[PDB]
Design a protein around this ligand. Structure first.
Ligand SMILES: CC(C)CCC[C@@H](C)[C@H]1CC[C@H]2[C@@H]3CC=C4C[C@@H](O)CC[C@]4(C)[C@H]3CC[C@]12C
Ligand SMILES: CC(C)CCC[C@@H](C)[C@H]1CC[C@H]2[C@@H]3CC=C4C[C@@H](O)CC[C@]4(C)[C@H]3CC[C@]12C
Lengths: 168, 115, 115, 168
């Protein structure tokens, strides 16, 4: 998987995982429906917490996302924000970035994620591996080989980050 | 942009989900509160009270308060005063609602059951 | 333009409230129909049927169909297929519900009174 | 009145008459509610018809309108659609017109109205007097003396209608 994804021939495509979340919610609540706890001695029925499960899940299935794509094809594409059907965002450069983001807890442990910044764009969250910096800029270099745009690091410009287009 | 297409399919504008959910929660909770005060004041048929569902609607109350506050926090950064006024008003009415129903429940102790 | 301000104050977008009136009308009429069917099938509580409100809710039905239809006419020329599909689907379900309630009212005829 | 409103120093202001319809609906319900007809012998109760009346009357009363105005100030004003609070329509000329409109019945009687045409503008309905053509272009020339833009007749251009600004 280390070599397959860096090229991303022409377009990229993307999706969301709220369908997964609603899926185990639906499984859990269907389990809850049949043979729940019998707490009539508690002078209360707890069937309405699954009713909220119904509501939350049905709303989450109401968020369907077909193949979030852009105009990232290896050409003079404008990175217009493209969905099957409707289209919303357009822009001549200066909005699409790839930025490193950091999060911290009370103890001080640092967690590193990546976000394809833009007008209502999709992130670049890696698959559950964030404890060390490893190589960082190499993936930005592969993105640069793709359609060189940006590679933004934490805080301000300073150093250690790369830009390709600027509106001055 | 095209708010027809924004409200049509595949998504909703950021925020404005929790606000509408809090509105419908407010509607159903005025329904049950009005039924409770009605049956407590005149018709006196306590067997058909909401003496049976007492903690799940309290849980619904606090989660509705939380979603109203969370939607207010998520919609404050729009830069528009009308949205902030909308969110603050719905939060205020929900909170005063919660205090009113808590006071009514605390007044209605001697009618439910005894441990 | 700013649909926050369009939905905020002093007006509504053209149409788009006739449709929501049709929505709430369809909701409450489905509630009435479900109550009638439930009360007719099992529990047999002819005292508490809607045998008393008969012609007013039928007039409500016909003004619901008229409002939905002329709202579809008022929203057709926007040039967008989604609005037309929404209005036509609401018209279809309203007509189907009206015909179903007419059939139910004609079937349950020996249960109200005699003239 | 013939020398008061056609002058119209600077801005104009306008309103709707739906407040009247709402207030009459409230009046007729205050008539109905106390001692209506007693048709229990009709096996019916007729209280829900005014419930619908108050639904439509409250909706009509909700249509509040502070002083619909424009930039018809006797200057190089660009005719921006102005409302106390929000503002909607802005346009550099070629959209504000004053057009004659015609209506006909089955018999063939003609009813004449006037409309200040534009992007969600307000009309110029005269006070319940349209049986003869009278003067036609006199009020159009008064509007021309005010802030000369247009005076559009029925059908196509042909003749007998006046333009001042054209977008070509
Ligand atoms: C799940 C979220 C959206 C909250 C929804 C709560 C609903 C399901 C609850 C809250 C209030 C409840 C009602 C409160 C009072 C009555 C009257 C009583 O004699 C029988 C139960 C009945 C008819 C309840 C039915 C279920 C009810 C409508
Ligand atoms: C917006 C309004 C005007 C349209 C809907 C009309 C409303 C007010 C009407 C239509 C259906 C009606 C209900 C139909 C059935 C029942 C059961 C009956 O045994 C007592 C009256 C009751 C509870 C009615 C109350 C009033 C009601 C809800």
């Amino acid at each position: 998987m280390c070599w397959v994804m860096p090229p991303s021939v022409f377009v990229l495509e993307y999706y969301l995982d709220t369908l997964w979340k609603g899926t185990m919610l639906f499984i859990i609540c269907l389990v809850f429906i049949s043979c729940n706890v019998l707490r009539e001695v508690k002078y209360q029925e707890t069937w309405c917490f699954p009713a909220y499960g119904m509501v939350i899940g049905l709303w989450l299935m109401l968020s369907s996302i077909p193949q979030r794509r852009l105009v990232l094809n290896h050409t003079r594409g404008m990175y217009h924000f493209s969905i099957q059907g409707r289209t919303v965002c357009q822009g001549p450069m200066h909005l699409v970035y790839v930025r490193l983001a950091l999060s911290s807890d009370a103890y001080g442990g640092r967690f590193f994620q990546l976000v394809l910044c833009g007008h209502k764009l999709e992130p670049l969250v890696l698959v559950q591996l964030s404890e060390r910096y490893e190589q960082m800029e190499f993936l930005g270099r592969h993105l640069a080989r793709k359609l060189n745009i940006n590679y933004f690091d934490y805080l301000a410009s300073s150093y250690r980050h790369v830009v390709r287009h600027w509106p001055l | 942009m095209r708010w027809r297409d924004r409200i049509a399919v595949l998504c909703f504008p950021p925020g404005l989900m929790l606000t509408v959910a809090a509105l419908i929660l407010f509607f159903i909770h005025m329904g049950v509160f009005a039924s409770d005060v009605h049956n407590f004041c005149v018709i006196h048929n306590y067997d058909h009270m909401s003496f049976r569902y007492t903690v799940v609607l309290i849980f619904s109350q606090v989660i509705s308060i939380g979603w109203a506050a969370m939607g207010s926090l998520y919609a404050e950064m729009t830069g528009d005063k009308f949205l902030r006024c909308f969110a603050l008003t719905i939060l205020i009415l929900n909170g005063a609602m919660f205090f009113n129903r808590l006071c009514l429940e605390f007044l209605a102790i001697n009618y439910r059951e005894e441990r």
